[PDB]
């Protein structure tokens with residue numbers, strides 16, 4: 001693990017030099033929870049490479065720069081109430097929890113991954129992350145409204161439930177476009193002056209499958 005962490009520190013330094021990681025909060029989160037903690041043993045040797053990696057059930061853990069970009073856009077602060085849609089390995093949720101210092105809610109539709117993520121989080125000593133099995137395109141009403149909702153799967157359009165569950169002034173970060181390609185990373189802010197949207201570039205996440213996602 002010592003060798004793996006050395007490589008990871010270089011990755012974080014690189015992201016900072018690239019201007020990808022720009023806040024100390026995101027840098028600290030990345031250093032506390034290296035990506036190798038979230039992937040199967042056979043992929044740990046590649047955890048420091050800035051590329052997405054496979055996880056069970058045909059899904060993947062995002063590339064380090066993509067996770068960093070989304071966290072920086074989120075502008076997370078202690079005490080915020082965050083909902084992540086698409087737990088996967090639980091890596092992103094762990095990072096979020098380190099920054100907000102409170103309960104984080106994350107939803108995953110595949111039972112196998114709910115278990116996978118729970119094991120990774122427990123193994124890493126994370127307690128504030130709460131993994132729920134369900135259709136995240138419907139959000140998670142029990143703990144709404146949220147300061148930020150971070151969706152890590154691509155949707156064909158912006159799910160209305162996610163907008164409804166945002167606090168006034170809150171934001172939704174979500175990929176919108178085609179099934180598994182040609183998606184645009186959107187930053188959607190819910191304000192009194194209306195819904196404001198900023199496009200952040202092309203991406204290619206796994207599809208958001210659900211009632212308000214893909215069929």
Ligand SMILES: C[S@@+](CC[C@H](N)C(=O)[O-])CC1O[C@@H](n2cnc3c(N)ncnc32)[C@H](O)[C@@H]1O
Pocket residue numbers: 059060061062085086087088089090091092093107108109110113134135136137152153206207208209210211213
């Ligand atoms: C490829 S992963 C992204 C990364 C993940 N955030 C991590 O830290 O590993 C995201 C996923 O969202 C799931 N996802 C898709 N549709 C979903 C839905 N309707 N509700 C919840 N999760 C969904 C997939 O099964 C998959 O694991």
